[PDB]
Amino acid sequence: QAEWRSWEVNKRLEYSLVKGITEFIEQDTEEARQQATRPCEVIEGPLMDGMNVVGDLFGEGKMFLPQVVKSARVMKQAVAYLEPFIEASKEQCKTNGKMVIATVKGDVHDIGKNIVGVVLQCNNYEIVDLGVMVPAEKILRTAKEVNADLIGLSGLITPSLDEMVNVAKEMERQGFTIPLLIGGATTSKAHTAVKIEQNYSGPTVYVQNASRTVGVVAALLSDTQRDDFVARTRKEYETVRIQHGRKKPRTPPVTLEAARDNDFAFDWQAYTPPVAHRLGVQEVEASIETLRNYIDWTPFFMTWSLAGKYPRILEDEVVGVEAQRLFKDANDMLDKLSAEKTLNPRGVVGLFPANRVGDDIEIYRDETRTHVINVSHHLRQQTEKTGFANYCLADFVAPKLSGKADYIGAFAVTGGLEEDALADAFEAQHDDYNKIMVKALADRLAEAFAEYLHERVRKVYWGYAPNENLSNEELIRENYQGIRPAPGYPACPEHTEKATIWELLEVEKHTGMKLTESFAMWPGASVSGWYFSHPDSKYYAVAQIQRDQVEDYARRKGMSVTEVERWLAPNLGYDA
Ligand code: B12
Ligand SMILES: Nc1ncnc2c1ncn2[C@@H]1O[C@H](CSCC[C@H](N)C(=O)O)[C@@H](O)[C@H]1O
């Protein structure tokens, strides 16, 4: 027996979808297609009734994202078996609308996209996923090729915002009318209103997450709301476009010269930077077993729309149960991935003699410090400050003109070069659950590798904190000496400098990890950055800089003032 196996066929479907039961979806939907006069009645019928149940169930707080994707696995697997019958008997089945989704050119991270997409499919909307590093050309060409009502763009890094504005300007040059939805971690409501919208006659809507998205595609794609929604979006996008537009960013900029005279104050003659126990470039690798203990699960829960900090989240009266099951699954997969060695985290680390020179860091070939093998550039905050200094990462390395011997470190790690293969496999068998799982887990593994390696550097490779012994909780709170800023973050926005790290460490040749034109890393599950030992070194944002630094930086980088303005776009204190 089973009780639910004694219910109506289209009732067992609703049950299997909601509960995510896969075992009987095959030999249960084939029976429902017989009752129906055509293949599209099962999809448009019981198959969607259940998803409609998942939808309100979800909206009430009795169901969460992790479970929802599990329902999709049953649906998408029901369609898969029922697609040979549909096409071989025509009819494209009624849908709520079509959409072309893709990760901007140059970018590579797509976890958030995969989520937005799956959720939309759970609302019958049809989604065509072009993947990542997709050229604006194929994007607009695909949307036309298969008549799409909406185009969705994703972007993780700053350089993506440029390619986005590009897509909008092209949609205008080509006459597109359909709405443009821009989302991602790099996308904000202010940028969409101040830099994206105005370049397109059609609607342009920014949407935080994958839940309020189905709500936008709903009103924006309807008839009784479509018009009112755009007008509201426009007005608002103006009260903000003119909000930021003028009423000038109160916080008077400063001469790059004055900033430099306010550089971090420190008596270097009295201080002696720890000497690295080791110098050189080392190919590193850690097992999943060693890295699990360094994993910070909080961001992992965020990724699945489960609010709460680990481990307290496991006891939450609302999502604790589901967080537990999601946690158990992740660990189940790690056990397999580790035992089979199907996913292998790897990286490279390096320490070099170094000294500051202006706002940059010279890196020497050896301890004689006679030959400079490379330069780390870095930018300086260009804002008036009282009580504080105009920070520049270089400031934390001993000045060349101090005679003090200092150093600088670099690293590049990835959760595994197999991330993509693995994702594709699940992608094949229409398993969105662990397709997302494996990538989210590869990401945790990468960040875990960065925490582990930073510890090894502090305790061994660099060796200034050999006796240091912190708990994972203690590591996450960064209650240790030194920092590891990563190109792209606030204190070092210029993404191009990742080239410096890749040159010093010869990353690609050593690990396989790659770099794109937009300077995104591959695999997606990968991290890279620097290492500073100074006990006074901390994170901060370079924020908005002026024309003077853009030019000085241009000279130093050997780039046009034009090229550097594109790369520091989000940090420019003036207009483009
Ligand atoms: C841990 C984390 C990571 C992860 C894993 C999870 C992830 N990305 O989703 C990993 C380890 C891969 C990572 C690394 C890097 N990161 Co990171 N990361 C973070 C952090 C702390 C959390 C983001 C998170 O977990 N997102 C949750 C996921 C599920 O959400 P999401 O991607 O944003 O997607 C949601 C929505 O935005 C939406 N959406 C997504 N796409 C679309 C598309 C459409 C069309 C629509 C309608 C909606 C929509 O739907 C999603 C589900 O709700 C943030 C800070 C922050 N809070 O934003 C930075 C942040 C994204 N990282 C940043 C940077 C700099 C980097 C690195 C280059 C760092 C380095 N190592 O040098 C690399 C990129 C690696 C590469 N391959 O190129 C930046 C800045 C962007 C910039 N200036 O380029 C951020 C904002 C940090 C900051 N404060 O400056 N990242
Ligand atoms: N202002 C800043 N400038 C440069 N890098 C920064 C920064 N703020 C954060 N970072 C980088 O991002 C890291 C924090 S995010 C990584 C740890 C987090 N618990 C997780 O698992 O996702 C910092 O350690 C540093 O590597």
XYZ file of C-alpha atoms and ligand atoms in Angstrom:
693
model
C 0.000 0.000 0.000
C 1.068 3.610 0.636
C -2.180 5.554 0.975
C -1.186 8.188 -1.576
C -0.834 5.406 -4.146
C -4.570 4.827 -3.750
C -5.521 8.371 -4.709
C -6.595 9.790 -8.066
C -3.788 9.764 -10.652
C -3.648 13.545 -11.025
C -3.769 13.628 -7.219
C -0.692 11.419 -6.855
C 1.062 13.821 -9.222
C 0.217 16.813 -7.069
C 1.448 14.828 -4.058
C 4.684 13.648 -5.686
C 5.448 17.149 -6.944
C 4.930 18.884 -3.597
C 6.718 16.199 -1.567
C 9.330 15.812 -4.277
C 8.872 12.055 -4.700
C 10.787 10.893 -7.800
C 10.426 7.103 -7.687
C 6.877 7.050 -9.115
C 6.799 10.107 -11.391
C 7.549 7.949 -14.449
C 4.966 5.196 -13.965
C 2.310 7.682 -12.861
C 2.320 10.413 -15.492
C 2.141 7.917 -18.353
C -1.223 6.902 -16.919
C -2.350 10.522 -16.721
C -1.511 11.157 -20.371
C -3.869 8.373 -21.401
C -6.812 9.965 -19.597
C -5.994 13.208 -21.395
C -6.902 13.676 -25.053
C -3.479 15.188 -25.784
C 0.075 15.312 -24.301
C -0.233 18.988 -23.298
C -3.159 18.397 -20.951
C -0.991 16.605 -18.397
C 1.553 19.432 -18.274
C -1.073 22.177 -18.365
C -3.262 20.108 -16.053
C -2.284 18.143 -12.896
C 1.412 18.787 -13.469
C 0.795 22.504 -12.931
C -1.950 22.130 -10.317
C 0.670 20.726 -7.987
C 3.130 23.512 -8.753
C 0.316 25.945 -8.002
C 0.084 24.161 -4.652
C 3.820 24.510 -4.175
C 3.413 28.181 -4.975
C 0.884 29.170 -2.317
C 2.284 26.612 0.101
C 5.588 28.441 -0.360
C 3.969 31.858 -0.046
C 2.509 30.889 3.322
C 5.806 29.849 4.869
C 5.131 26.129 4.988
C 7.643 25.461 2.237
C 11.056 26.847 1.279
C 13.401 27.160 -1.700
C 15.334 23.927 -1.124
C 12.046 21.972 -1.233
C 10.704 23.967 -4.162
C 13.613 23.005 -6.421
C 12.952 19.411 -5.399
C 9.422 19.763 -6.768
C 10.985 21.103 -9.975
C 13.067 17.942 -10.201
C 9.834 15.934 -10.284
C 8.150 18.285 -12.743
C 11.119 18.686 -15.091
C 11.518 14.899 -14.946
C 7.814 14.384 -15.719
C 8.102 16.631 -18.761
C 11.343 14.938 -19.825
C 9.578 11.579 -20.059
C 6.560 13.256 -21.618
C 8.437 15.295 -24.234
C 8.797 12.504 -26.827
C 4.995 12.230 -26.861
C 4.378 15.972 -27.161
C 6.741 16.879 -30.001
C 6.011 13.637 -31.868
C 2.407 14.854 -31.723
C 3.022 18.606 -32.116
C 1.671 21.315 -29.820
C 4.043 23.402 -27.673
C 1.744 23.409 -24.617
C 0.318 26.595 -23.132
C 2.885 28.580 -21.137
C 2.811 31.836 -19.152
C 5.530 33.427 -21.246
C 9.017 32.861 -22.625
C 12.303 34.370 -21.414
C 15.938 34.377 -22.469
C 18.300 34.206 -19.502
C 22.087 34.476 -19.595
C 25.162 35.513 -17.665
C 26.724 38.596 -19.231
C 29.779 38.300 -21.520
C 33.019 37.696 -19.637
C 31.277 36.764 -16.395
C 31.109 33.155 -15.241
C 29.122 32.801 -12.003
C 25.562 31.555 -12.549
C 24.197 30.083 -9.286
C 21.836 33.002 -8.722
C 20.707 32.798 -12.334
C 19.994 29.064 -12.123
C 17.790 29.860 -9.125
C 15.811 32.633 -10.797
C 15.345 30.356 -13.784
C 14.159 27.234 -11.955
C 11.719 29.266 -9.847
C 10.230 30.792 -13.000
C 9.791 27.361 -14.558
C 7.859 26.510 -11.397
C 5.403 29.160 -12.542
C 5.170 27.616 -16.023
C 7.156 30.475 -17.578
C 9.481 29.088 -20.261
C 13.181 29.776 -19.770
C 15.923 29.553 -22.384
C 19.297 29.522 -20.623
C 22.157 30.630 -22.854
C 24.635 29.934 -20.079
C 27.481 32.219 -19.056
C 30.058 34.423 -20.835
C 27.282 34.991 -23.368
C 27.893 37.683 -26.014
C 25.270 40.441 -26.163
C 24.868 39.415 -29.818
C 23.643 35.861 -29.148
C 21.449 37.208 -26.342
C 19.405 39.560 -28.512
C 19.605 37.105 -31.404
C 18.220 34.212 -29.350
C 15.414 36.351 -27.926
C 14.379 37.146 -31.500
C 15.013 33.631 -32.824
C 12.516 32.127 -30.371
C 10.233 35.097 -29.618
C 10.862 35.914 -25.972
C 8.706 38.292 -23.962
C 11.556 39.096 -21.611
C 15.336 39.152 -21.487
C 17.146 38.483 -18.243
C 20.753 39.476 -17.567
C 23.002 38.230 -14.757
C 26.271 39.667 -13.463
C 28.548 38.956 -10.491
C 31.395 41.441 -11.005
C 31.551 45.196 -11.681
C 32.814 44.792 -15.275
C 29.487 43.108 -16.018
C 27.529 46.324 -15.421
C 29.297 47.674 -18.503
C 28.235 44.769 -20.727
C 24.715 45.164 -19.330
C 24.337 48.830 -20.290
C 25.678 47.581 -23.607
C 22.804 45.117 -24.069
C 20.274 47.891 -23.324
C 21.853 50.300 -25.820
C 21.772 47.520 -28.416
C 18.141 46.673 -27.680
C 17.434 50.315 -28.502
C 19.528 50.377 -31.695
C 17.591 47.303 -32.827
C 14.092 48.390 -31.860
C 13.345 45.874 -29.094
C 10.157 46.557 -27.144
C 10.189 43.750 -24.576
C 11.123 44.380 -20.900
C 14.722 44.148 -19.690
C 15.301 42.587 -16.274
C 18.760 43.073 -14.839
C 19.879 41.224 -11.726
C 22.993 39.940 -10.018
C 25.242 40.634 -7.050
C 26.875 43.538 -8.882
C 23.541 45.098 -9.871
C 21.784 47.682 -7.714
C 18.587 49.722 -7.908
C 20.529 52.981 -8.139
C 22.752 51.836 -11.013
C 19.838 50.438 -12.995
C 18.111 53.808 -12.670
C 21.178 55.980 -13.247
C 23.031 53.893 -15.843
C 20.821 51.193 -17.399
C 17.250 52.446 -17.928
C 17.786 55.687 -19.866
C 19.593 53.716 -22.592
C 16.433 51.814 -23.530
C 12.987 53.010 -24.641
C 11.506 49.775 -23.348
C 10.959 48.807 -19.687
C 14.026 48.112 -17.549
C 13.463 46.617 -14.111
C 15.972 45.676 -11.442
C 14.889 42.940 -9.050
C 16.679 41.917 -5.853
C 16.012 38.170 -5.779
C 14.301 35.238 -7.510
C 11.050 35.563 -5.554
C 10.047 39.136 -6.371
C 11.047 38.298 -9.937
C 8.086 36.033 -10.647
C 6.041 38.909 -9.264
C 7.540 41.351 -11.751
C 7.340 39.074 -14.777
C 3.719 38.655 -13.707
C 2.563 42.281 -13.547
C 4.967 43.418 -16.259
C 3.677 40.663 -18.553
C -0.027 41.160 -17.823
C -2.567 43.568 -19.298
C -4.331 44.975 -16.239
C -1.065 45.875 -14.508
C 1.631 46.051 -17.184
C 1.094 49.749 -17.922
C 0.732 50.908 -14.314
C 3.862 49.021 -13.219
C 6.169 50.582 -15.815
C 4.968 54.103 -15.009
C 5.570 53.465 -11.311
C 9.016 52.048 -12.028
C 9.832 55.074 -14.185
C 8.759 57.693 -11.643
C 10.600 55.945 -8.816
C 13.670 55.427 -11.003
C 13.569 59.201 -11.395
C 13.101 60.293 -7.785
C 16.318 58.315 -7.389
C 17.923 59.231 -10.706
C 17.512 62.878 -9.737
C 18.184 62.026 -6.092
C 21.694 60.795 -6.867
C 21.794 62.860 -10.041
C 22.244 66.089 -8.111
C 22.198 67.145 -4.458
C 25.902 66.312 -4.909
C 27.524 63.410 -2.970
C 28.305 65.394 0.161
C 31.840 64.389 1.101
C 34.287 66.747 -0.707
C 36.993 64.916 -2.711
C 40.665 65.719 -2.168
C 43.833 66.271 -4.177
C 45.518 62.932 -4.813
C 48.502 64.861 -3.476
C 46.834 65.781 -0.195
C 45.556 62.225 0.202
C 49.082 60.891 -0.263
C 50.378 63.269 2.414
C 47.745 61.793 4.732
C 48.844 58.232 4.011
C 48.832 55.771 6.921
C 51.027 57.230 9.672
C 53.561 54.735 11.022
C 57.077 54.852 12.470
C 58.736 52.199 10.329
C 62.218 52.637 11.778
C 60.885 51.187 15.033
C 59.014 48.320 13.398
C 60.447 45.223 11.729
C 58.024 43.280 9.490
C 58.104 39.562 10.137
C 60.357 37.755 7.675
C 58.589 35.052 5.693
C 59.741 31.548 6.571
C 59.356 30.751 2.908
C 59.637 32.536 -0.415
C 58.547 31.413 -3.833
C 55.535 29.936 -5.539
C 54.023 26.703 -4.334
C 51.357 24.545 -5.954
C 48.949 23.664 -3.157
C 46.087 21.251 -2.693
C 43.892 20.181 0.187
C 41.352 17.382 0.398
C 37.650 17.907 0.993
C 38.097 16.189 4.359
C 40.565 18.832 5.490
C 38.522 21.737 4.115
C 35.109 20.774 5.549
C 36.319 22.000 8.947
C 37.039 25.394 7.442
C 33.700 25.778 5.685
C 31.491 28.732 6.609
C 27.938 27.448 6.075
C 26.101 30.732 6.626
C 26.532 32.022 3.004
C 25.500 28.561 1.860
C 22.129 28.913 3.642
C 21.695 32.420 2.225
C 22.167 30.961 -1.255
C 19.141 28.703 -0.667
C 16.958 31.452 0.810
C 17.193 30.123 4.361
C 17.727 33.024 6.747
C 19.928 32.594 9.794
C 23.518 32.208 10.921
C 25.068 28.757 11.347
C 24.724 26.777 13.534
C 21.808 28.515 15.282
C 19.818 28.290 12.029
C 19.544 24.532 12.593
C 17.338 25.211 15.614
C 15.118 27.937 14.187
C 11.473 27.105 14.835
C 10.710 27.989 11.216
C 13.506 26.897 8.869
C 15.643 24.811 11.234
C 14.155 21.538 10.027
C 14.687 22.410 6.357
C 18.128 23.884 7.029
C 18.981 20.543 8.650
C 17.848 18.532 5.646
C 19.641 20.885 3.256
C 22.716 20.610 5.512
C 22.465 16.831 5.606
C 22.205 16.682 1.814
C 25.224 18.961 1.294
C 27.272 16.814 3.644
C 25.983 13.646 1.987
C 27.333 14.956 -1.314
C 30.632 16.001 0.234
C 31.055 12.471 1.539
C 30.572 11.086 -1.959
C 32.627 13.797 -3.686
C 35.439 13.150 -1.193
C 35.412 9.353 -1.263
C 35.347 9.256 -5.060
C 37.747 12.200 -5.386
C 35.444 13.457 -8.127
C 35.962 17.087 -7.039
C 39.484 18.251 -6.161
C 40.235 21.673 -4.621
C 43.575 23.070 -5.730
C 45.512 26.304 -5.815
C 48.786 28.155 -5.552
C 50.413 30.440 -2.994
C 53.449 32.690 -3.072
C 55.548 35.011 -0.923
C 57.918 37.628 -2.315
C 60.259 40.298 -0.979
C 58.413 43.566 -1.456
C 58.459 47.240 -0.652
C 56.147 50.191 -1.135
C 56.795 52.925 -3.663
C 54.112 55.574 -3.803
C 50.735 53.887 -4.038
C 52.139 50.657 -5.485
C 54.179 47.686 -4.262
C 57.417 46.630 -5.977
C 58.059 42.879 -5.961
C 61.660 41.684 -6.142
C 63.119 38.554 -7.686
C 65.075 37.736 -4.541
C 66.270 39.131 -1.226
C 68.929 41.368 -2.776
C 66.013 43.506 -3.962
C 67.913 44.644 -7.043
C 65.553 43.219 -9.668
C 61.834 44.082 -9.744
C 59.809 41.174 -11.184
C 56.387 42.831 -10.959
C 54.294 45.644 -9.497
C 51.069 45.579 -7.475
C 49.264 48.850 -8.081
C 46.386 49.571 -5.649
C 44.333 52.778 -5.333
C 44.065 55.400 -2.575
C 40.853 56.732 -1.024
C 40.328 60.220 -2.397
C 38.014 61.763 0.174
C 38.561 64.403 2.838
C 39.198 62.762 6.182
C 39.677 63.921 9.741
C 41.017 61.599 12.417
C 41.649 58.931 9.789
C 44.081 58.551 6.905
C 43.509 58.153 3.176
C 44.075 54.416 2.956
C 45.999 52.565 0.294
C 46.923 48.904 0.704
C 50.511 49.771 -0.239
C 50.672 51.831 2.979
C 50.774 48.558 4.936
C 54.056 47.470 3.338
C 57.361 49.001 4.489
C 58.405 52.013 2.358
C 61.319 51.299 0.016
C 63.074 54.350 1.440
C 63.077 52.838 4.937
C 65.508 50.000 4.306
C 63.183 47.642 6.155
C 62.753 44.203 4.579
C 59.082 43.434 3.940
C 57.021 40.967 1.897
C 53.753 40.367 0.071
C 51.774 37.195 -0.563
C 49.405 35.919 -3.224
C 47.055 33.020 -3.717
C 44.541 31.511 -6.104
C 42.324 28.583 -5.110
C 39.363 26.775 -6.640
C 36.879 24.268 -5.234
C 37.721 22.011 -8.169
C 38.308 22.101 -11.926
C 35.496 19.548 -12.147
C 32.784 21.950 -10.999
C 31.488 22.356 -14.569
C 31.593 18.695 -15.588
C 29.681 17.784 -12.427
C 27.143 20.559 -12.923
C 26.526 19.419 -16.490
C 25.935 15.826 -15.425
C 23.140 16.844 -13.049
C 22.045 19.340 -15.687
C 21.721 16.393 -18.047
C 19.434 14.335 -15.803
C 17.346 17.475 -15.185
C 18.447 17.541 -11.543
C 18.464 21.231 -10.637
C 18.755 20.362 -6.962
C 22.323 19.052 -6.881
C 23.260 20.981 -10.014
C 22.924 23.980 -7.694
C 24.187 21.969 -4.717
C 27.510 20.995 -6.328
C 28.252 24.554 -7.416
C 27.264 26.041 -4.053
C 29.409 23.374 -2.437
C 32.311 24.029 -4.815
C 32.068 27.674 -3.729
C 32.112 26.785 -0.020
C 35.113 24.559 -0.729
C 36.921 27.416 -2.457
C 36.330 29.904 0.317
C 37.217 27.177 2.806
C 40.506 26.701 0.946
C 41.189 30.426 1.212
C 40.629 30.341 4.979
C 42.771 27.232 5.422
C 45.609 28.560 3.262
C 45.573 31.962 4.960
C 46.053 30.071 8.229
C 48.912 28.010 6.777
C 50.503 31.260 5.568
C 50.152 32.939 8.977
C 51.382 29.898 10.912
C 53.866 28.287 8.507
C 54.712 29.746 5.070
C 55.018 33.286 6.386
C 55.271 32.066 9.998
C 54.448 35.124 12.146
C 51.674 33.320 14.024
C 52.813 29.692 14.436
C 51.206 29.343 17.902
C 47.927 30.872 16.751
C 45.021 28.447 17.106
C 41.498 29.700 16.437
C 38.112 28.014 16.100
C 36.265 28.219 12.790
C 33.972 30.755 14.439
C 37.094 32.641 15.439
C 38.459 32.575 11.865
C 35.210 33.903 10.392
C 35.425 36.835 12.815
C 38.923 37.453 11.427
C 40.342 37.608 14.940
C 43.873 37.199 13.581
C 46.844 39.169 12.261
C 46.890 40.348 8.660
C 44.339 40.517 5.868
C 43.834 38.902 2.459
C 42.141 41.494 0.218
C 40.894 40.188 -3.117
C 40.888 42.243 -6.359
C 37.377 43.545 -6.923
C 36.496 44.207 -3.276
C 36.316 47.764 -1.812
C 39.997 48.214 -0.834
C 41.226 47.056 -4.233
C 38.421 47.459 -6.848
C 40.591 47.364 -9.986
C 39.813 43.818 -11.232
C 42.618 43.950 -13.779
C 45.212 43.481 -11.039
C 44.218 39.812 -10.982
C 46.643 39.650 -13.925
C 49.423 40.620 -11.525
C 48.565 37.664 -9.274
C 48.298 35.338 -12.246
C 51.711 36.446 -13.465
C 53.438 36.210 -10.065
C 51.938 32.827 -9.260
C 51.724 31.605 -12.857
C 48.241 30.477 -11.793
C 46.983 29.007 -15.058
C 50.087 26.924 -15.745
C 50.063 25.644 -12.123
C 46.367 24.979 -11.439
C 44.311 25.258 -14.608
C 42.290 28.138 -13.238
C 41.757 30.747 -15.971
C 41.093 34.458 -16.366
C 38.560 36.111 -18.718
C 38.643 39.411 -20.593
C 36.421 40.858 -17.896
C 38.905 39.325 -15.457
C 36.501 36.856 -13.905
C 37.972 33.563 -12.785
C 37.215 30.039 -13.923
C 36.063 27.680 -12.525
C 33.329 29.820 -10.992
C 34.130 28.295 -7.620
C 37.440 30.092 -7.211
C 39.063 32.832 -5.144
C 42.310 34.790 -5.337
C 43.924 37.665 -3.464
C 46.876 39.103 -1.581
C 48.356 38.609 1.890
C 49.471 41.396 4.192
C 51.123 40.782 7.544
C 50.923 44.223 9.197
C 48.902 44.019 12.424
C 47.324 47.381 11.581
C 46.148 46.380 8.088
C 42.379 46.366 7.625
C 39.654 46.454 4.976
C 38.139 49.692 3.688
C 36.774 51.036 0.421
C 38.711 53.171 -2.043
C 35.307 54.524 -2.985
C 35.133 57.429 -5.422
C 38.407 58.744 -6.833
C 39.122 61.755 -9.039
C 40.620 62.559 -12.441
C 44.135 63.068 -11.048
C 44.423 59.507 -9.713
C 42.760 58.116 -12.838
C 45.562 59.712 -14.857
C 48.444 58.867 -12.537
C 47.103 55.298 -12.357
C 46.780 55.241 -16.160
C 50.462 56.110 -16.553
C 51.458 53.423 -14.043
C 49.228 50.763 -15.609
C 50.118 51.797 -19.140
C 46.461 52.255 -20.095
C 44.444 55.070 -21.629
C 42.640 57.355 -19.200
C 39.587 56.005 -21.047
C 40.278 52.341 -20.308
C 40.955 52.923 -16.603
C 37.706 54.882 -16.275
C 35.730 51.905 -17.532
C 37.422 49.590 -15.027
C 36.949 51.964 -12.116
C 33.508 53.095 -13.262
C 31.760 52.303 -9.944
C 34.505 54.176 -8.109
C 34.681 57.295 -10.250
C 33.967 60.460 -8.288
C 32.861 62.168 -11.494
C 30.744 61.369 -14.559
C 31.541 59.088 -17.503
C 30.590 34.241 -0.797
C 30.376 35.089 -2.086
C 30.988 34.575 -3.263
C 30.984 33.082 -3.782
C 29.735 32.045 -3.727
C 28.187 32.395 -3.791
C 27.624 33.331 -4.912
N 28.340 34.062 -5.615
O 26.383 33.322 -5.110
C 32.314 32.936 -4.459
C 33.351 32.198 -3.533
C 32.327 32.150 -5.822
C 32.650 34.461 -4.731
C 33.830 34.925 -5.268
C 34.131 36.135 -5.854
N 33.567 37.297 -5.562
Co 32.055 37.230 -4.360
N 30.680 37.499 -2.997
C 30.178 36.551 -1.991
C 29.202 37.413 -1.052
C 29.743 37.572 0.457
C 27.746 36.722 -0.996
C 26.822 36.501 -2.306
C 25.843 35.317 -2.216
O 26.123 34.319 -1.468
N 24.857 35.465 -3.098
C 23.662 34.664 -3.052
C 23.294 34.201 -4.427
C 22.348 32.983 -4.454
O 22.662 35.348 -4.880
P 23.042 36.194 -6.176
O 24.214 35.656 -6.914
O 23.199 37.612 -5.869
O 21.662 35.958 -6.945
C 20.319 36.340 -6.380
C 19.826 37.682 -6.990
O 20.782 38.763 -7.134
C 19.020 37.316 -8.258
N 19.560 37.555 -9.623
C 20.682 36.904 -10.060
N 20.879 36.945 -11.391
C 19.717 37.478 -11.874
C 19.333 37.662 -13.256
C 18.022 38.211 -13.547
C 17.767 38.427 -14.991
C 17.051 38.571 -12.486
C 15.621 38.889 -12.885
C 17.427 38.422 -11.033
C 18.809 37.872 -10.741
O 18.545 35.935 -8.012
C 19.363 35.265 -6.932
C 18.604 34.318 -5.927
O 17.892 35.068 -5.131
C 29.119 38.760 -1.757
C 28.432 40.049 -1.010
C 26.936 40.279 -1.311
N 26.241 40.125 -0.311
O 26.499 40.520 -2.477
C 30.308 38.902 -2.790
C 30.467 39.691 -3.987
C 29.384 39.182 -5.007
N 31.774 39.143 -4.532
C 32.603 40.119 -5.206
C 33.897 39.839 -5.877
C 34.891 40.999 -6.034
C 34.377 38.432 -6.044
C 35.690 37.722 -6.668
C 36.324 38.333 -8.016
C 36.831 37.756 -5.494
C 38.271 37.203 -5.650
N 38.458 36.029 -5.328
O 39.153 38.008 -6.094
C 35.188 36.330 -6.957
C 34.476 35.844 -8.286
C 35.016 34.496 -8.801
C 35.001 34.325 -10.314
N 34.939 33.147 -10.641
O 35.060 35.314 -11.091
C 31.728 41.509 -5.099
C 31.723 42.800 -6.033
C 31.437 42.811 -7.441
C 32.622 43.545 -8.071
N 33.076 44.650 -7.768
O 33.103 42.861 -8.981
C 30.694 41.325 -4.011
C 29.339 42.202 -4.083
C 31.433 41.851 -2.705
C 31.694 43.298 -2.232
N 31.211 43.607 -1.140
O 32.386 44.051 -2.960
N 31.678 35.312 -4.242
N 37.032 45.884 1.876
C 37.649 44.827 1.355
N 38.713 44.987 0.553
C 39.324 43.944 0.018
N 38.917 42.707 0.244
C 37.860 42.471 1.034
C 37.195 43.540 1.618
N 36.196 43.040 2.342
C 36.229 41.715 2.219
N 37.235 41.362 1.420
C 37.568 39.983 0.988
O 36.406 39.154 1.180
C 36.632 38.340 2.346
C 35.363 38.157 3.183
S 34.105 37.110 2.361
C 34.844 35.460 2.644
C 34.567 34.908 4.045
C 33.070 34.670 4.256
N 32.844 34.154 5.614
C 32.570 33.645 3.235
O 32.695 32.440 3.538
O 32.081 34.093 2.175
C 37.735 39.065 3.116
O 38.407 38.137 3.973
C 38.627 39.390 1.921
O 39.130 38.177 1.354
